[PDB]
Structures are given as C-alpha cells and as structure tokens.
Amino acid sequence: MRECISIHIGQAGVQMGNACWELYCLEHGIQQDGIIPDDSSFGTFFSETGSGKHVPRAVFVDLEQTVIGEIRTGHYRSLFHPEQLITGKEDAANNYARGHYTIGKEIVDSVLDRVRKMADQCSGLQGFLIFHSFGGGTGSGFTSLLMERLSVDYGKKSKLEFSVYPAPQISTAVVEPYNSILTTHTTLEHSDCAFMVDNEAIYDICNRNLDIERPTYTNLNRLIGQIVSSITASLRFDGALNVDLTEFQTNLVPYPRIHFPLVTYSPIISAEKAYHEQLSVPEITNACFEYSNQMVKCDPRRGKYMACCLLYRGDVVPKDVNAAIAAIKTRRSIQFVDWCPTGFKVGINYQPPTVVPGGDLAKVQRAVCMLSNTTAIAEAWARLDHKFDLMYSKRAFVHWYVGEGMEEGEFSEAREDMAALEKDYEEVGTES
Amino acid sequence: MRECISIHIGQAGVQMGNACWELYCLEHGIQQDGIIPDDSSFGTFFSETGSGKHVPRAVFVDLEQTVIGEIRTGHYRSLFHPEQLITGKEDAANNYARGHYTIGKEIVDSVLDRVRKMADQCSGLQGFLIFHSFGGGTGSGFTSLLMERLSVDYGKKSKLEFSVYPAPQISTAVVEPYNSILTTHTTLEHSDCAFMVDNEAIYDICNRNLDIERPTYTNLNRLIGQIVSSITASLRFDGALNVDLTEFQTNLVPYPRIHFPLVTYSPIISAEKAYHEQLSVPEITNACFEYSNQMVKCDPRRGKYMACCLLYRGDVVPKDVNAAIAAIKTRRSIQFVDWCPTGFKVGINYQPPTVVPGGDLAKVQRAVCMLSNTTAIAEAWARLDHKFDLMYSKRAFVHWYVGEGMEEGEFSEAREDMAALEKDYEEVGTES
Amino acid sequence: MREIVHLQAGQCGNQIGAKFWEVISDEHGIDPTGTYHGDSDLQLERINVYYNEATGGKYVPRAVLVDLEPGTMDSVRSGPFGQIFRPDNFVFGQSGAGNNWAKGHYTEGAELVDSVLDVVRKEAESCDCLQGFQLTHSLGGGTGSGMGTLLISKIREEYPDRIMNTFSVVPSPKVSDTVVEPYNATLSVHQLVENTDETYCIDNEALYDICFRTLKLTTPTYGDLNHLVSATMSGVTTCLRFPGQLNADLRKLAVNMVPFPRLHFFMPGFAPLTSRGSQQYRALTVPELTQQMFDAKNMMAACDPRHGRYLTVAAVFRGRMSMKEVDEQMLNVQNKNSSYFVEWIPNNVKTAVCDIPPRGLKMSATFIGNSTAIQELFKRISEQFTAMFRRKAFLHWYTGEGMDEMEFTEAESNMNDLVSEYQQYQDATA
Amino acid sequence: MREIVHLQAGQCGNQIGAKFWEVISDEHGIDPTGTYHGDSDLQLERINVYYNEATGGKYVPRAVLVDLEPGTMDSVRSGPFGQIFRPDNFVFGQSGAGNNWAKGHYTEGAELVDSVLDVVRKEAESCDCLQGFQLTHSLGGGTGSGMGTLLISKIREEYPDRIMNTFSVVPSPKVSDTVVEPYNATLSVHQLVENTDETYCIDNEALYDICFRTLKLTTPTYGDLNHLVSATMSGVTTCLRFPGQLNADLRKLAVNMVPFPRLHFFMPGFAPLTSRGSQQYRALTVPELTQQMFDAKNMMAACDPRHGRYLTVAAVFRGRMSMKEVDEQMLNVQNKNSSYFVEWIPNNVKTAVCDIPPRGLKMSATFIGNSTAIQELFKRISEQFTAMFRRKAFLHWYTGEGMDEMEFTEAESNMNDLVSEYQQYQDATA
Ligand SMILES: Nc1nc2c(ncn2[C@@H]2O[C@H](COP(=O)(O)OP(=O)(O)OP(=O)(O)O)[C@@H](O)[C@H]2O)c(=O)[nH]1
Ligand SMILES: Nc1nc2c(ncn2[C@@H]2O[C@H](COP(=O)(O)OP(=O)(O)OP(=O)(O)O)[C@@H](O)[C@H]2O)c(=O)[nH]1
Ligand SMILES: Nc1nc2c(ncn2[C@@H]2O[C@H](COP(=O)(O)OP(=O)(O)O)[C@@H](O)[C@H]2O)c(=O)[nH]1
Ligand SMILES: Nc1nc2c(ncn2[C@@H]2O[C@H](COP(=O)(O)OP(=O)(O)O)[C@@H](O)[C@H]2O)c(=O)[nH]1
Ligand SMILES: [Mg+2]
Ligand SMILES: [Mg+2]
C-alpha cells in the first residue's frame, strides 16, 4: 500500500507523536536503534535505506526547543533523521498571532522544504496526518499556516488531523477560547476531517475503565496511539474489506463544514480485569455507543449520529460484525439522522493490537474503533463560542494579539464564522 | 587519455592546489613520498620517471615566498619537482598593477619556461587548469599576464580556470572592486570558461550541510578539490559517456563573453548524518537546483539557466539520470531560456569519490556535480560594478595603481567593459 | 472454441476472482504452478476455454485483474495461487478510489482504463472463437462500480455482439459496509441496464443466511461466501467445458431468461448445501435437490421470490442424472406453485444437464431466476437515494470529481422506470 | 561471397561495435582469441562474411575502429574481447572532438580521414565480392557526426554502387546528453540524405522504454541497450551467413523499403523481448511474435507509428518456422490496420526466413519500418535548430573551425524539404 506522511506540531503533537512511533516500531518489530532485526507493510510509514536502518516518514515542528530536545536525546535519537526534528528559538506563548503571523512564518518555509523533499521521494502519497492542539500558539497558529500552505502545493490530497479539542470544564490555559476558535475559522476550509479528542474524557475513561488512579500524558498518549494505529492498520496489514485513507472523508463528511467525527475505542480493560471478561464482538461494538466511552466529552444521546466508520481489528468474524451493527440500528435510544439511512462503514484487518512493554491496557485478541460524526458536538462549539463571547465582549486580551500583527476584525470574523457553523449543524439535525 | 596541466597562482591557487593534489594521490593510491606502492589513468596528471616516483604535471607560482615555502617543507616536499614551485621575493600587496605591470613581468617569463618544458614533454595536451583569486595582486594581476601569454604561444588550446569570485557581503580586503573588475576586463577575451566560487557560499553550506560550526580554508579547499576531481574524472577513469575537457566550453558557453558557470556539488553530508539518508539518484540531482546548494551565493530562481553540465560519478544507473533530468525540465520554478531547448550535458564515470583521511564529508557511493550557466550571475557583476563606482567616483585608491605604471584610463575602460557585459547578459535573458 | 475471458475489478472482484480460479483449477486438475496433473481426458479437451497454454504444460488463465490501488492485488500475487496469473495481466494503479463513483469513473478510472483494454485485446485476439466476457465487481464500492461500469461500457462498444455476464454484489437490504452505497449503486444500475446482457444480483446478507441456517459454520465470512459464489458461477459455464446430454451456453440462458432487454437482473441459487455433520442424514436424489432451489432459504439474493412472480427460470444440473426425474420434478414445481409464475409465459423452466459433477460431489444444480420480486431491491435503493439526495447529502464529493447533479436525476429517473417495468408484469393475462 | 566491412566511429559507435562482435562471435562459436570452437558446419561456411582468416585458425574480424581520442578505444583494446581485432585497424587520434561538428568534419577529421581509407581499402581488396559497408555512429556527438559523415561521404565516392547501411543513434525527443545536438544532428542529416542507402534511426529514450516496460531490469543502461541494438543489426545480416527458405540481403531490403532516394530513414524493432521471470508464462508461436512488432511499445525509435502511415515494412524471421503462419499473420496485420498503410502501395510487407535462430532462442524476427511518422523527429530537430540559430546560440564555435553560417541555412532548408516530402504521402489515392 502507498505512503502516508505524519506532521506533528506543537508540544501536544510532538509528545503525542513519540507515543505513536513507539507502537509502529513494535507492530513491525523495528528496534529503537532504527535497525530491523536480522515486510512490505512498513513501507507506508518507514522509508528504506541502503543499510538496515529504516527512517520514519514524519516531520516534527515546535517553536520551543525544549520539547523536541527530549526526543533528540532520548532512546529514539537514532530513529529520526536529524533534519526532520525542526525546532525554533522561542515559544509562541499560547498566542495565535505569534504562531500564525510573526514567528510562525519565520520557520514555516523550513518545514515545507522537508515536507516536499519527503513528499517527492514517494511514487504515490495518500495524504498527511497532522497532530496539534487548539489550546496553544504553535499547535493552533503554526498549524493554520501549514494547512494553508499544504492546501496549495499539495491540493486535492488527503489531510487528516487528530486534534486536542478544548475540554468542557478543565483547562490548562486561560486564552483557549480565543486561540481555539481562531484556528477553526481558518482550518474549516483547509482540512478533510478532524478527529477531536478531549483530555477530560480520556482521563475519565482511564480512571473509570483502565482502573489506574494517577494517569499522566505519557499514559494518555499511548491510548491515543491505539486509535491512530487502528485507523492506519488498513494501510499496512492485509485483511478483508480494507479501508483506505481517503475513504474516511467520503463516509464521514456529508458537507464540507461538518467534518468533526469524535473518536471512540474499545476495549479499554486492564490486564487483571480482562480475565473476568469474554470480549465478544457485540460486547466491544455496543461499548462504543454509550456516552461513558468517548474521547470527546459529549453525550451522543443529546444529538443524532449522521455517519459512522467502524474499523475492526484482530481475529474478527464479519458475520458477527454484521449482526452486531444491525442490532444498534434498531434501538430507540440510538438515533440516526433522517436523511442518512445508510450510516455505517465497516473495516477489518487481520492484525490484533500490540501491547507496549510495561503498558497498562491488556493484550486484547480483538478491538474496534469508531469515528462517528454526531450533531451533539455542536454543543461543544456553542459552549466555546459562549466562553469566547464573555471575554471579547469586554475586550480582555486582544492587546496581546493586536501587537502581534493581527487585525482587530479577525476576532469578529472568527465568531461570526463559528456562528454559521452552529446554524449549519442545526439544519442538518432536522428533516426537510 | 591525454594530459592536462594545472597552473596554481597566488596564495589562493597554491593553497587550493595542495588540497587538490592530496586527492589525486589518494585516487591513484600514490604515496606522499611520490613513489607508488609495489595505472594508465594517472598519466594525465602525473609524469613518469625511470624510478617509481611520478611527478605531478603542475606549476606553482606566487610572488610571496611565504605560501609556497610551507609546501616546500611539508610532507609533500618530495612530491613536486623543485623547479616547479616558483617563488618571488616580495608580495604584490593586493595591487593589480604590481602583479600585472611591474613585479608580475619580472617572473612571468620564468613560469612560461617551465610551462613550455612541461607542455612540450606531452605528445598531446588537452589544455590548462588555472586556479587564482580575483581579490589579490598575484591572483589577479599575474594571472592576467599568464592568460595573455598562454593565449599566444598555446592559442587554440583549452584554458579552464577555477576562481574565487568576490563574496557578496563578506570581504577579506578593501580593494576587491578595483582588482576584481580589472582582471575580468583582461580575462574575458583570453579564457574559455571560469568556474566561479564564493567563500561565503561555501561557508554557508559547510555550516548548513556538513554540520561543522568552525570551518577553515583547509576544510573548504578540500571541498573545492571534489569539484575538480569530479570534473577531471572523465580524463582518468573509464566510464560510459565520458566527457572530455574541451566539451565543457562548447556546452556551457553560448557566446564568447558568457562563460561564467557557477559550480554546484552534491551530496555534502556528514558521516554520521549520512546513515539516515538514502542518497538516490534523483535526490542528489534535485539537490543541485536549489539556491541553498551553490558555491556562488547567487539565487538561480532570480535568473534563468542557459546551459548545464551534469558530471555523475560512482555506480550510477543512467536510466535514473535520464528520468531525474526529465523531471527538472518540467517544473515551473525551474526556468531555462527560450532559445536553448536542449540545455543539459550528462557525464558518467565508474569511480566513486574517495574520502581524504580524517575528512569531514562521508564516503558516498554516488555523487554529482553541476556546472550550470545562469543569467542570475549578472546580479553579482552589477553589485561589483556598483561597489567599484562608489570608490572610483571619488578617486579613492587610484594613486596606488597609477604609481605602479598603470594608466588612469584603465579604470574607465574596465568599468565600461563590464557595463557592456551587463547588457549582454540582459539581452540573452529575453527572447527575440 | 467458445472462449471466455474473465474480468475482475475492485477489492471484492479480485477476492471472488481469486477463489474463482482455485475452484476451476481443481476441476481440471491444474497445479497452482500451472502444470496439469488431472486424471480424466475431458479436462484437457476444453481446458482452452479458460486457460491458455505455454510450452512445457504451463497453462495460463486469461483473467484480467484491475484495481486502483496495489493493496488487494499484492495479496493475490503473494497468495499460494498467485503464481499462475500472467504478471502482465495485473493492472494496478497508485491512488485507489475512496468509494466515490465519480473518481473511479471520470478522473481516476479514465486514466487507467486505456491500459486494461490493451490487455483484454491480447486475450481477445488469442481466442479463435471468443464467446463473451465475464465480470465480477461490487456496486457499492468505487472501483467495482466506477471503473467496472466504465470498462463494461467500453467492451460493449468494441464487442457489441459478444456476451457479457456480470456476477455483481448488491448492497444489503438493512446492513451496509459503506455510507454512499445508494449513490454508487444507483449510478451503477443506470449504467448496466444499457450494456450488460445478464447480471447475477447477490448480496452478503442473504449469503450469510446460508452459512448458519442451512450450513452450521459461524467462523468464516469472506473465505467461504466467495467459495459458494465461485461454485455458482462455475456451474453456469460448465456446459462449455464438459460433455452434457443437453448442453447449455451463456447465450442459451440469456435468450431463455431475458424476455425484454431491460429485465436481465437475476438471482442465483446453488444446491446441495449441507453441513458435513448432517450430510449423512440426507438423500442425494434429484427430487430433494430440486425442492430447495425454489425456497427463499437458498436464494443468494435478499429478495424473497414469494412476494413476486417468476418470469423465467433456468436450471443447470450436473453429474449422471436421470433426465426423466430432471423433468418430472420441474413440471411438479410449476403446478404446485402456479401463483409464483406469470401466465403470459407458458413455460418458465429451462433445463441443462452436464455429465461431470463438481469436485467433491456426484450431483449439483445452479438455479438462475428472473423474478419481479427483484424490483423491491431497486425500489429500496431509490428510497434511500432520494432521501439523501433530497438534501444533497454527499453530492459535493461527487460533483468535485467531474460530475453533475443532473446525472443523479437521470440515474434516479431511469431507475424509477426499471421498477415500474417490473411492476407491469404482476398482472395476469387480460 | 557478399562480404561486409564494418565501420564504427565515435564513442557510441565503438561500444555498439564492441558488443556487435561479442554477439556474432557467439553465433559462429568463435573464441575471443579468434579460434573456432563451434559445433555446426554452417558457421564456417559463411564465416568469411565478417571474419578474415590467418593460418592456425585465427579469424580476424574486419572492423575499422576510428575515434579522435584514444580514450574509448583503449577500453575496447583492454576489454576481454579486444584481443580479436587487428591492431592495425584501430585508427586513433590525439585531440578528440568537443561535440562540435565542424572540428570533426573540417579541421580534425580531415587530418585523420586519409588514414582510415588506407585501412578500408585493404579490407576492401581482401574480399572477393564486397557487398557493402556498415557504419555505426551517433548524430549528436562530434566524432560520430563530423568524421562519420565525412567518412561515409568518401566511401560513397569510391564505392558508389556498393551498399552502405547505417545504424545511427538519433537525439531523444525530450532528454539530451549534449547541448548542441540540433546543430550536430541537423548537419548530419543534410549529409546522409545524399550518401547513405538506408539508415536505422534509433534513440536511447525509446530503447530505455523497452528495458523497464516489456523487460523488468532497471540496473543497466549502456551494457544492454547496445546488446538489443547488436541483436537487431545481426538479424538484418543473417541471410548472408546462414541458409534460409527465403533468403534476404541488404540490397533486397533497400529496394523493398526505399520507394524514393530521399526516404530511407527506418526505425527497427526486435522480438521476442521477455523478462526471464515472465518468459515461462508466454507462448513462443509465430502469431504472438508478430503482434508486438507493430505496436509502439516495441519500437526502438521515439516516433509512434500510429500518428503516421507505413510506406514499406520488412520482417526477417529466424529459426524453423512455418511459412504459412509467417504469411497469414502479415495479411492479418495489413487488414486489421488498413489505416496505418498507404493505399498507393498495394503491398507493404516483406518477409524473409532464416533456418538458424539467434543464440539462446528458437524463434526471432527483426522489424524494419519506413513510416511517415518519422517526419515528426526531423520536424522536432528543426524547431530546436531554428530557435537556437535564430539568435546565433553557438555559431561562433562552429564558424571558428572552418565553417560558414550559410551551410546552416542549407542544412535547415534541406531538412525542411525532407519533412515536407514525408508529409505529401499522408494523403490517400486521388
Ligand atoms: N493528550 C495530550 N495533550 C497534551 C499533551 N501535551 C500538551 N497537551 C495539550 O496541549 C494543550 C495546550 O497546547 P500546548 O500543546 O501545550 O501548547 P503548544 O502547542 O506547544 O503551543 P505553545 O503555547 O506556543 O507552546 C493543553 O491544554 C494540553 O491539554 C500531551 O502530551 N498529550
Ligand atoms: N577557498 C580559498 N580561498 C582563499 C584561500 N586563501 C585565500 N583565499 C582568498 O583569496 C582572496 C584574496 O586574494 P589572495 O589569494 O589572498 O591574495 P594573493 O592572490 O596571494 O595576491 P597578493 O595580495 O599579492 O598576496 C581572499 O579574499 C580569500 O577569500 C584558500 O586557502 N581557500
Ligand atoms: N463476497 C465478497 N464481497 C466483498 C469482499 N470484499 C468486499 N466485498 C464487498 O464489496 C464492497 C466494498 O467494495 P470495494 O471493493 O471495497 O470498493 P472498491 O474496490 O473501492 O471499488 C462491500 O460492500 C463488501 O460487501 C469479499 O471478499 N467477498
Ligand atoms: N546506445 C549507446 N549510445 C551511446 C553510448 N555512448 C554514447 N552514446 C550516445 O552517443 C552520444 C554522444 O556521442 P559521442 O560518441 O560521445 O560523441 P563523439 O564521440 O565526440 O562524436 C550521446 O547522445 C549518447 O546517447 C553507448 O554506449 N550506447
Ligand atoms: Mg510549546
Ligand atoms: Mg600573496
């Protein structure tokens, strides 16, 4: 199968990316030194070399030298090509303007140079994977630059993105409403579909299901690696009814703006706890249609589903998949939209998930991941627009952004654009 | 293949020449003592003897005894015939007039005597290689003498020259504009093509690619040796589609005055960094068509290419060379002139580059060198004419030159000649 | 003599294709390497119907395998049985279709289709009498619909007279492995009705039912459903490969089973389908074999024949069978179920018997039925198509790949007329 | 009896020459030392066509190797197969041509040409019936064009009646290994049209296509392209060396393939060209062999025959082949592609069969085609020539070596007329 590029932006992207590439090395049995022990699958994410040392086909960018420096000196130092790890001199300071107008453009061209040199060295290219955070300067301002630049030079190629959408209540910053909304305004027209995830939801699942009281980002990012691994498994391992990268956008994006399918995964069970469970196909399948198992803390029952992609993994009997999916279609609580009778997309690969050494989650013989697109997510956008309106009403933090070469009206346009997004979701939630 | 003579002039030429002849001894496995260990290739650059000690077919000239004295006492003292190393009594003092009118002519005849005695002892003679610097008295004034003398006694024979063209911003002297322009006026009509190189560009590449923070002329001259070795490899080692010395001028000189092809080389990668790279044929090929890899700090994208010679080396699949070259011909950013549809000249030799012991650059299995001729170089000449006009407008340094037997009008003619060169470049940049 | 050239497109097509040649190679005793090791001479007498030949006994099956991404085909090539196909036949792209019909029909199939005909023509001019083409794909997907319909249209232009039968997977009535199945299916039907001589509509849901209901084997889905499909299509082409008392042919069934040009979508059935453990508790005589063909329990289509009426029916028996029993039972079937057959056609059953049975059996029969109950399927697709299209559910993906919404209306209007035509033949005579 | 003397000039010529004798020596079983060790007597019966003889069995191939610099020839001499050539044949200069036509034609070839004729005449008077000369060079370069055209002009004066065929490399349509290819090529064509009886235009780009497309071998460029070329030219001269049912000859092809004196630029093709791994999946019968000759996939020229029309076509088969199949297929080709052949010539195919096949094969055939599509090539060269010459791109190098710009205009005007003449024969009769 053909290659796919991974672009990791900001502290969230870089830190999350390291978790992902630990899994890939384990799936293909690649040593952390880069040298495979003494096949055709890894070509999609790994580039060959005359020696036995394969090179990951990813690029890391961060305006702050601190985060990447840990990778550059860690046990994966020899895995990455030294020029891929791009580092700036000063952080964006949780400022959208800095990472998008003043300092973001100083290093944007350098990143493109490595993307082009890496994109040109593949006969075919499915698209780009992009990891970033709405609640940062680099992960929100610099990302918007790449989305725009990657839309012109490589237009009409897939651009999938996993994003850390701001949590409903918890918050590790103060300017999340301003920064998060601004990038959404610019990334709406320059992206295919965004796989939102909330740290609040992942923390809740970790304490609720994984049964560990004291998690950390090093733990959550490993869970986030699973959804990426299952999503991209079809591009590496053989299996009946393989799902390509470009198939997600067609199935999960009815309209250009409505491209926010929240992520879900199953089963998340601790090693000891799993011994008391059966893990049948319906069990894992029905575990993804409850508001207690979501990576974004939104209640699906509040809204309506309008598209769902199921990417089954491991030793799966598709007959059971057909039966399990049929049952979910005939439950009153589960509610799909009126104008989408055909609201599922199945995918199976014969490769059970791998367990990172010392990992928390168990060695499941079978797993499933869902990418449902639900109008209940409009609640999150409305809440974010509400928080944004509270601050900008008094003009409480704009002086930081204006001084960074950002026009005043951008905030006005940003909210108005999100206002239309709310109405667009509302109309889709009804029937004509 | 037939012989080629090397003439090294000035401190730049002598210091650069020593770097070159270190490579030649390594390529042919010749001991620094001059005695080969206990074949037909070295005859082009080395003269045989009854004993096993071969003699380089080169001549070193410098008006200052200091530079050559280092060679005369170094580990290569026994390599050179003692009479080849010609030394004066006093330096030219960064004065074009001294090295061309007063002191240059005192030793010019001595150099010719050794050139004739060395040129007559070869059944055939391809031409002369000349290394000098625009920004010196010996390397600019004495050179012009040899170019004139070598144009009469040995007219209609190739005279190739590598020159240290003045850098755009950095400068190790104050009278570079006067001296550099004067030699160009005299060397335009008495040369085939000049391979310009700038120390600013080479320093930038060394810190940018070779990844060493503190270079020195001893390091750069080794890089300059590679371009010479690759250029002359066709005259020594067997290989498909060999390129002779006289072929460069025909391909890269559309008009007699437009004979300034800036040099480019690839790959320049450190030993440790190379382990993370593949070094495919297109990769090295596409690395020579970006303004970040040039020996002269000029941006090709500003101007237009009008001739290019590619001298591939090592284990090269010419099919890949054909494919890689074709791709470069179909990119909008890459722009050739309208009246030169056929703008390439390929050359391959089956001899991978050799690594000097303790050298910085890696042991590449394959390499490429380009000798593109671009109208973007007219920018450098215009800048040099601008700096010259600033000084001579106030008549700020002429008294040094006038007192050295140099007429006043020479400066006037020198600028006017360069003025026509600018217009000649301008016309070639358009289409009739 | 009466050569058939096989086409397989899309992920479903290749996998069905792959298990389609593992069955035929078993019937003719052909080793995976292409070396013949059979026992009966009849295998060689017609081995040229599917397999070409190369000195040394290497038999090359003329299949043409086409897909827009190397993924599935690389599996077939690395398969144990992938050493048999001619490497020149695999036609692989580098950017697969994302289940959108337009991409596999306008922007991406267009670039790759010209290469395929260059491989069909070589297999077409290497046959002394080319009977017709064979195609296996899926309507729901993008490659099996986009390029499959594009390719079937092209081969219709050059070979209008030759037969072209299609074994095509149809979207299931209630479950769906893709969201855009109505758009893709609706466009595909509008494009087949004008080009394909006969189509064998099948669906996984109905074929799943066979696995657990009449058989008792829950583990497999795709490794075995394809094998039931492969046996069915092999039965149809048996008369062209082995001697028979009443030899049939792709053209014979078309004439018998296609009253009108636009009514050519059948629904196959196969027997016997017994579990290994319950097989010894069953007789293998002709009467019982024939009973299960006409029950909706053993129909590989989701449509139940009871709701509609048969227009034409064809049976292709195999093995040493008494032709009297082969004929008395059919007369019995017609009279018992007189309400299931239209009056304006006096006889609705076509019979054909082949002497050589399928591997591992002494008796078999492939049912092919043209029933007006199949109109339910298209009616259902139209209901789903109009609902999504009523609000432009996904048209932006299809319009952006060189397409117009006017084509969707044409596909919906043409589909509506196909449903209406099937409905006219529910009334009785006068 | 019908002796041929071989000429090779330039770097390309010698390397092609070098691999030209490694093939022939293999056919006749001649050891690199010149000692015969063959098995079949027919090898000796006509060994005098290419090889002279010296007491003790030493067979001396009469090739004349000429180049303006010792570089390439020293490699041939040091080659494993360099011990066979007569040392007196190597004609080496001391100042090679810098790809400028004038130097290799006026100032430098003039000084060396007289020496070559002194070596041709000895090989010419040592043959009892000298049929014609053979020449291999490159138009783009300086030595293969300058001296090659100078030498071909001279041998035309002394031997006007004798045949003189040229296997010449032509500049590629889009890639170029030299900047002055239009100047050199344009002058060369203006000089061949008047002297050469038949020319075999070939180009690397088209010949590259064979390597990866029909074969699957990416590593080599020059070690193997020359071997395909060597096999092609060997096929043309096979009839003069081995018995055949319908023996052909350099004069027979010229008459059949040259309607008018100025239309003699053909474009060869060879078959079979199969990869080692896919060879066992292919039949070696006559029909398939003939199909690939007429497809632009297996044409060693950059020009596609589809855009134009064939004027005359010649096939030279080899091995034990049924002459009925050799003839039925050609009638088939003419009728299938009636638009590809001109009407004003009733028959366009010439056939010739040799009993002995090429080494390592039991069947083969060399295609030689005269198509008006070749006018595209000259048309393209003229477009490039006029663009550079419109501003005097490089004329100063050529004028300074004893030449005038009036010659360039004559070369452009004569070339323009060659293009026009080919264009007249696109219209049909009346
Ligand atoms: N899941 C996960 N989220 C993270 C991780 N690290 C940071 N985040 C999220 O990132 C959000 C803020 O954006 P950051 O990534 O920290 O900031 P940035 O992208 O580096 O941009 P700067 O402010 O210029 O540094 C926080 O609210 C965190 O929730 C991580 O390792 N895993
Ligand atoms: N690349 C390279 N350039 C050098 C080297 N040595 C001197 N140069 C260049 O030479 C330029 C000045 O000309 P010089 O060679 O130093 O002076 P000269 O040719 O000896 O003439 P005089 O002034 O009479 O000594 C400086 O600007 C340097 O850039 C060297 O070893 N390597
Ligand atoms: N019978 C059968 N059907 C399959 C198989 N694989 C996929 N399918 C069906 O094919 C459809 C998907 O089509 P696909 O080939 O993936 O789309 P495309 O290749 O992009 O045109 C699904 O509805 C499946 O039901 C298989 O192995 N056997
Ligand atoms: N087929 C083939 N062509 C070659 C070979 N070497 C060079 N050429 C072609 O010859 C041309 C160069 O001509 P060359 O012999 O070097 O010029 P000259 O010897 O100075 O007249 C190029 O365009 C090459 O394509 C070879 O080994 N085989
Ligand atoms: Mg940061
Ligand atoms: Mg000095």
XYZ file of C-alpha atoms and ligand atoms in Angstrom, chain B residues 240-242 244 247 345, chain D residues 9-16 67-69 72 96-100 137-146 169-172 176-178 181 202-204 207-208 221-223 225-226 229, ligand 4:
80
model
C 30.074 5.230 -20.048
C 29.582 8.610 -21.737
C 32.916 10.123 -20.773
C 36.442 15.399 -22.301
C 33.453 19.583 -24.208
C 25.077 17.612 -20.860
C 33.065 5.802 -35.248
C 32.670 7.872 -32.112
C 32.315 6.724 -28.517
C 28.832 5.320 -29.121
C 29.902 3.546 -32.301
C 32.819 1.662 -30.763
C 30.813 0.500 -27.747
C 27.996 -0.652 -30.032
C 37.896 7.810 -32.991
C 39.557 11.178 -32.472
C 40.822 10.361 -28.960
C 37.246 4.754 -25.725
C 39.194 14.429 -29.656
C 36.250 16.441 -30.924
C 34.431 18.620 -28.411
C 30.993 17.683 -29.795
C 31.321 20.409 -32.460
C 27.838 6.255 -35.034
C 25.861 8.972 -33.238
C 24.453 12.135 -34.792
C 24.536 14.183 -31.589
C 28.260 13.895 -30.944
C 31.079 15.429 -32.945
C 33.123 12.402 -33.984
C 30.154 10.209 -34.902
C 28.708 13.065 -36.952
C 31.682 15.076 -38.210
C 21.650 6.948 -32.693
C 19.290 9.911 -33.009
C 18.777 12.650 -30.378
C 15.995 11.840 -27.941
C 19.537 15.345 -24.201
C 23.085 14.399 -23.219
C 24.500 17.312 -25.233
C 22.534 18.193 -30.616
C 17.223 4.682 -33.031
C 17.210 6.638 -29.782
C 18.013 5.796 -26.178
C 15.128 1.948 -26.112
C 15.059 2.767 -22.394
C 21.698 1.319 -19.487
C 24.655 1.010 -21.874
C 25.745 -2.590 -21.339
C 20.807 -1.272 -24.816
C 23.815 -1.916 -27.061
C 20.935 -2.965 -30.875
N 23.474 3.182 -27.446
C 24.547 3.837 -26.948
N 24.651 5.172 -27.148
C 25.704 5.863 -26.668
C 26.745 5.153 -25.929
N 27.658 6.068 -25.572
C 27.241 7.264 -26.048
N 26.075 7.133 -26.695
C 25.326 8.216 -27.348
O 26.243 8.986 -28.115
C 26.050 10.377 -27.884
C 27.398 11.002 -27.578
O 28.213 10.874 -28.735
P 29.802 10.713 -28.570
O 30.285 9.410 -29.157
O 30.178 10.830 -27.115
O 30.340 11.973 -29.408
P 31.711 11.885 -30.224
O 32.371 10.559 -29.958
O 32.615 13.012 -29.797
O 31.406 12.017 -31.693
C 25.099 10.518 -26.718
O 23.923 11.193 -27.160
C 24.741 9.114 -26.285
O 23.322 8.945 -26.240
C 26.557 3.699 -25.754
O 27.397 3.019 -25.130
N 25.468 3.132 -26.276
